[PDB]
Design a protein around this ligand. Structure first.
Ligand SMILES: [Zn+2]
Ligand SMILES: [Zn+2]
Ligand SMILES: [Zn+2]
Ligand SMILES: [Zn+2]
Ligand SMILES: [Zn+2]
Length: 113
């Protein structure tokens, strides 16, 4: 079972994700996403030159946040490091399918599709 999510990212993340077919582990090891996907969810916080990209991941890979967004946890995140110490399985970056560019942020303004 899969869920469509949305994320604002740099082109380098976009390309790596496309090439590997897998979600890229972020600089903190934690990848925040808009669920359900919405360009407007984090469009304000997004940096100029960023791309809004929607993609499909297994629903099971989405970790509960008690907030209006979802997150994907990687092996080197603090959550992953805690999991290993507790003898839990190492979190793994899930597959990402139907990767589609749905927006861009140019000169402080958000454009859809
Ligand atoms: Zn978070
Ligand atoms: Zn809008
Ligand atoms: Zn909050
Ligand atoms: Zn334009
Ligand atoms: Zn444009």
């Amino acid at each position: 079972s899969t869920a469509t999510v949305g994320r604002w990212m740099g082109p380098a993340e976009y390309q790596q994700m496309l090439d590997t077919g897998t979600v890229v582990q972020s600089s903190t090891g934690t990848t925040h996403v808009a669920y359900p996907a919405d360009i407007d969810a984090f469009g304000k916080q997004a940096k100029n030159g960023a791309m809004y990209v929607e993609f499909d991941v297994p629903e099971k890979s989405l970790v509960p946040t008690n907030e209006g967004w979802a997150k994907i946890v990687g092996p080197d995140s603090i959550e992953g490091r805690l999991a290993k110490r507790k003898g839990l399985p190492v979190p793994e970056m899930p597959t990402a399918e139907n990767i589609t560019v749905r927006g861009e942020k140019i000169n402080g303004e958000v454009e859809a599709k």
